[PDB]
Design a protein around this ligand. Structure first.
Ligand code: NA
Length: 129
């Protein structure tokens, strides 16, 4: 599913991401826009052999199991395919674990380089939330 901006903002809000560990909802929407262009089915392979999955481009080296990333941990305890669902619950639940891990949202390269320090409130402007 390719979300609209407000539709995803509302979904993320309902799943408890607004101000989760201090990150306002616009942060999460911004990260999703630049990680996946709001497409739950997005995959991208990395040089190390790992792959990033879903709306928040969660990596198979640490967080999910895709059966092809040797020595990977599966800290979210989920197949990586679960992260590509139109239902963002698994992505959200895993993202909460990631952002809790010590580096906050800096875990997401697109957030650090394209969202961090910008007016992220813009990403939820106009939405009914
Ligand atoms: Na893994």
């Amino acid at each position: 599913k390719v979300f609209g901006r407000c539709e995803l903002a509302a979904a993320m809000k309902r799943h408890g991401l607004d101000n989760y560990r201090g990150y306002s909802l616009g942060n999460w929407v911004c990260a999703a826009k630049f990680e996946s262009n709001f497409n739950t089915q997005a995959t991208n392979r990395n040089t190390d052999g790992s792959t990033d999955y879903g709306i928040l481009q969660i990596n198979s080296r640490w967080w999910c199991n895709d059966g092809r990333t040797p020595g990977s941990r599966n800290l979210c305890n989920i197949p990586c395919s679960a992260l590509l669902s139109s239902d963002i619950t698994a992505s959200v639940n895993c993202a909460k674990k990631i952002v809790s891990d010590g580096n906050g949202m800096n875990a997401w390269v697109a957030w650090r380089n394209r969202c961090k320090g910008t007016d992220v409130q813009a990403w939820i402007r106009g939405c009914r939330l």
